[PDB]
């Protein structure tokens, strides 16, 4: 029995060892070369589990129902089941049998090459084929491509095909001003150490019509990933890029020869998209003819995934931010469909996934307004758009009248002296305010004076019936909004910020079209969707109908008023609800006093579009309302 137990932890220290990559530490553990003892020497067991296991890519060896008995005096006879990770899938229930060898102190593994595979005997080989799989599609919701695979036309050089001297500097400067190209990039490619002179260097991808070829430059047709909106959707959709040796340890069914979504949704969708590898790996005589099949499977091509986004108001509502730093969602709030999540600046997909320079990286890692951000996935402050919020809220509560006026003196105003140096501001000094009036001029001091009336009780009541702290159903990495830090504000002045839409509030731009659907839906929020084919998913009663009915003709007025924040949206004809906003940025800033602006705007009269748009960091005299009226016009037109 102490001889028994000792067996059964040498073979699960040798497992282990396996199982951990160190090949050597497991070889340690066998006895000598011999006949009825280890088929081969350490540094021979070393090389052959590293060989085959390294060649299948094997990967989380583990085992189970481990029986350790008795056959002779001095050996112990050992079996169990054994499964593993392998490059073509998992490899279930292998018995695995050997003998132990207990002369000495110590207990050692008689090794033989079924410790390898189960039926492998002396100098059997292992061979593995793999066939790759082609990476699924991304498409709209009329099917339009995102992200798909097709043939781009790679423009090289070859170094020997140019001339000597001169006649070699002509051509350079001849395909470096005909392509785009630096006349020291197209040195500096044909320098790298990899170059020989007969080489194909390549240098760009030609996403159009090839010009006339100089002498040297010459296309090649490759395959690859393509992005057809280019840098309009390259936060939502991502990129893909070579796969390393460091993802195959992670996840050994990627293709070594393959791609891997680095960002976006083609790594949210990586396992959908990338399909899964075919082929065979077979166990084969000493000679190459095969004994037994480990594993085999066809070769499974990656599903394509169907998105809500529309591929003309993805690029609409891109190219309005017109580069500047901010965020553009659209919704058809009755299903939730995303129609468009705009992101700005961005950068270039396709050049990211075809070969990106070191300093064009670094330039996009190092950009102030950071291209890499996915905006309408960042929690900001709401700004004081959200005072429809904290109205409907006022208006379901009973605090709210609407035709009760506040006297309001000034652009400044605070409850009393103990807030110091702080005071809710207004732009504009209109002494009779109601809610209506409130909503026209976007008054933040009728708003913080209704919040603090209120109270905190009575505010969270309203706002815990939306979605604080929920994590949407969404391929988008994203964290809930929140309300504040705490479960309590402890502040008068953060509980009267919090009431139009600054404080600690923090909601993204997706969130905020969530919540603001509800005035679309008579008070019931509609949650946000964007695969296509997934259900509708809502919550009921989280406004009452009466504070929609009250506010969308406030809304209207907003348009319509002459005096309304976002009258030059009238110029459009169309049936418009919105409501502008603006909030103060806050965290470290390398400028202290920036100013974000926002637009929310629907259509009130068929509930077929929504639209929230932001823009961070705001130059002077620009706003999100100068910029929507085109991705408005497109739709109404195309979403009733």
């Given at each position: 029995t102490?001889?028994?137990?000792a067996g059964?932890?040498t073979?699960?220290?040798?497992v282990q060892?396996?199982n951990?990559?160190?090949?050597?530490k497991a070889?340690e553990m066998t006895?000598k070369?011999?006949?009825?003892?280890?088929?081969?020497s350490?540094k021979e067991?070393?090389?052959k589990?590293?060989?085959?296991?390294?060649?299948?890519?094997?990967?989380?060896?583990?085992?189970?129902?481990?029986?350790?008995?008795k056959?002779?005096?001095?050996?112990?006879?050992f079996?169990?089941?054994?499964k593993?990770?392998?490059?073509?899938?998992?490899l279930?229930?292998?018995s695995?049998?050997?003998?132990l060898?207990?002369n000495?102190?110590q207990?050692?593994?008689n090794?033989?090459?079924?410790?390898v595979?189960?039926e492998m005997e002396?100098?059997?080989?292992?061979?593995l084929?793999?066939?790759?799989a082609?990476r699924?599609?991304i498409i709209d919701?009329?099917?339009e491509p995102?992200?798909?695979?097709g043939?781009?036309?790679?423009?090289?050089v070859?170094?020997?095909?140019?001339?000597?001297g001169?006649?070699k500097t002509?051509?350079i400067?001849?395909?470096?001003s005909?392509?785009?190209?630096?006349e020291?990039a197209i040195?500096?490619a044909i320098?790298?150490?990899?170059v020989?002179?007969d080489?194909?260097?390549?240098?760009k991808?030609?996403?159009?019509?090839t010009?006339?070829?100089?002498?040297?430059?010459?296309?090649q047709?490759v395959d690859?990933?393509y992005?057809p909106l280019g840098?309009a959707?390259?936060?939502?959709?991502?990129?893909?890029?070579?796969?390393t040796a460091?993802?195959?340890?992670?996840?050994?069914?990627?293709?070594?020869?393959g791609?891997?979504?680095?960002?976006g949704?083609?790594?949210?969708?990586?396992?959908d998209?990338?399909?899964?590898?075919?082929?065979?790996l077979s166990i084969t005589?000493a000679?190459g003819v095969?004994?037994?099949?480990?594993?085999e499977?066809?070769v499974?091509?990656?599903?394509?995934?169907?998105l809500?986004?529309?591929?003309?108001?993805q690029?609409?509502?891109?190219?309005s931010l017109?580069?500047?730093a901010?965020s553009?969602?659209?919704?058809?709030?009755?299903?939730?469909?995303?129609?468009?999540?705009?992101?700005?600046?961005?950068?270039?997909?396709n050049?990211?996934?075809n070969?990106?320079?070191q300093?064009?990286?670094?330039a996009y890692?190092?950009?102030?307004e950071?291209?890499?951000?996915?905006?309408?996935?960042?929690g900001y402050?709401?700004?004081?758009?959200?005072?429809?919020?904290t109205?409907?809220?006022?208006?379901?509560?009973?605090?709210?009248?609407?035709?009760?006026?506040?006297?309001?003196?000034?652009?400044?105003?605070?409850k009393?002296?103990?807030?110091?140096?702080?005071?809710?501001?207004?732009?504009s000094d209109?002494?009779?305010?109601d809610?209506?009036t409130?909503l026209?001029y976007?008054?933040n001091?009728?708003?913080?004076?209704?919040?603090?009336k209120?109270?905190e009780k009575?505010f969270?009541?309203?706002?815990?019936?939306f979605?604080?702290g929920?994590?949407?159903?969404?391929?988008?990495?994203?964290?809930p909004?929140?309300?504040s830090n705490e479960?309590?504000?402890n502040?008068?002045?953060?509980?009267?910020?919090?009431?139009?839409?600054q404080?600690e509030?923090?909601?993204?731009?997706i969130?905020?079209?969530?919540?603001?659907?509800?005035?679309?839906?008579?008070?019931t929020?509609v949650?946000?969707?964007?695969?296509?084919?997934?259900?509708?998913?809502?919550k009921?009663?989280?406004?009452?109908?009466?504070?929609?009915q009250?506010?969308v003709p406030?809304l209207?007025e907003?348009?319509?008023?002459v005096?309304?924040?976002?009258?030059?949206?009238?110029?459009?004809g169309?049936?418009?609800?919105?409501k502008?906003?603006?909030a103060?940025?806050?965290?470290?800033a390398?400028?202290?006093?920036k100013?974000?602006?926002?637009l929310?705007?629907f259509?009130?009269?068929?509930?077929?579009?929504?639209?929230?748009?932001?823009?961070?960091?705001?130059?002077?005299d620009?706003?999100?309302?100068?910029?929507?009226s085109?991705?408005?016009q497109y739709?109404?037109?195309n979403?009733?």
């Amino acid at each position: 029995t102490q001889a028994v137990e000792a067996g059964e932890k040498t073979v699960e220290q040798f497992v282990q060892a396996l199982n951990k990559g160190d090949y050597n530490k497991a070889a340690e553990m066998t006895s000598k070369k011999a006949a009825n003892k280890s088929a081969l020497s350490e540094k021979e067991i070393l090389d052959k589990y590293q060989n085959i296991y390294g060649a299948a890519d094997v990967k989380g060896l583990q085992i189970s129902n481990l029986k350790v008995d008795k056959k002779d005096d001095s050996t112990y006879s050992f079996s169990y089941k054994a499964k593993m990770n392998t490059s073509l899938g998992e490899l279930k229930d292998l018995s695995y049998k050997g003998t132990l060898d207990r002369n000495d102190g110590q207990t050692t593994i008689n090794w033989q090459p079924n410790l390898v595979f189960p039926e492998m005997e002396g100098n059997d080989k292992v061979s593995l084929t793999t066939q790759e799989a082609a990476r699924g599609n991304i498409i709209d919701r009329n099917g339009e491509p995102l992200a798909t695979t097709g043939k781009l036309k790679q423009l090289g050089v070859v170094p020997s095909k140019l001339g000597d001297g001169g006649e070699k500097t002509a051509n350079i400067k001849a395909i470096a001003s005909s392509f785009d190209l630096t006349e020291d990039a197209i040195n500096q490619a044909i320098s790298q150490s990899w170059v020989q002179p007969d080489y194909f260097v390549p240098l760009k991808i030609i996403d159009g019509a090839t010009p006339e070829l100089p002498a040297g430059a010459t296309i090649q047709e490759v395959d690859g990933r393509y992005y057809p909106l280019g840098e309009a959707a390259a936060q939502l959709i991502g990129y893909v890029g070579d796969i390393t040796a460091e993802d195959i340890d992670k996840n050994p069914e990627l293709s070594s020869n393959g791609k891997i979504g680095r960002s976006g949704l083609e790594m949210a969708f990586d396992k959908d998209l990338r399909g899964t590898t075919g082929g065979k790996l077979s166990i084969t005589d000493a000679d190459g003819v095969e004994k037994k099949v480990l594993i085999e499977h066809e070769v499974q091509n990656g599903k394509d995934i169907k998105l809500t986004i529309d591929a003309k108001a993805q690029k609409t509502a891109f190219d309005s931010l017109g580069g500047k730093a901010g965020s553009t969602v659209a919704t058809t709030p009755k299903t939730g469909d995303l129609l468009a999540l705009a992101s700005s600046p961005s950068y270039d997909p396709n050049k990211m996934t075809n070969g990106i320079s070191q300093e064009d990286y670094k330039a996009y890692e190092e950009n102030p307004e950071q291209p890499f951000i996915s905006r309408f996935a960042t929690g900001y402050a709401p700004g004081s758009t959200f005072k429809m919020i904290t109205a409907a809220i006022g208006l379901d509560n009973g605090t709210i009248d609407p035709n009760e006026v506040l006297t309001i003196n000034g652009l400044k105003w605070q409850k009393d002296s103990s807030w110091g140096s702080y005071q809710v501001t207004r732009v504009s000094d209109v002494s009779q305010v109601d809610l209506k009036t409130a909503l026209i001029y976007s008054d933040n001091i009728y708003t913080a004076q209704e919040t603090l009336k209120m109270g905190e009780k009575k505010f969270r009541t309203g706002l815990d019936k939306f979605i604080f702290g929920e994590d949407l159903d969404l391929p988008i990495s994203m964290n809930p909004a929140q309300i504040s830090n705490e479960d309590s504000f402890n502040s008068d002045i953060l509980l009267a910020d919090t009431g139009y839409g600054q404080g600690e509030l923090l909601i993204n731009p997706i969130q905020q079209a969530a919540m603001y659907s509800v005035f679309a839906n008579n008070g019931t929020l509609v949650y946000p969707k964007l695969i296509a084919d997934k259900e509708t998913k809502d919550k009921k009663n989280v406004i009452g109908e009466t504070a929609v009915q009250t506010i969308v003709p406030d809304l209207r007025e907003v348009v319509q008023d002459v005096n309304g924040t976002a009258h030059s949206l009238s110029a459009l004809g169309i049936p418009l609800a919105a409501k502008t906003g603006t909030a103060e940025i806050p965290a470290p800033a390398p400028a202290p006093g920036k100013e974000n602006s926002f637009l929310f705007a629907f259509n009130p009269d068929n509930q077929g579009y929504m639209m929230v748009s932001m823009l961070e960091n705001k130059e002077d005299d620009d706003s999100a309302t100068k910029r929507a009226s085109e991705l408005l016009q497109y739709l109404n037109q195309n979403y009733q």
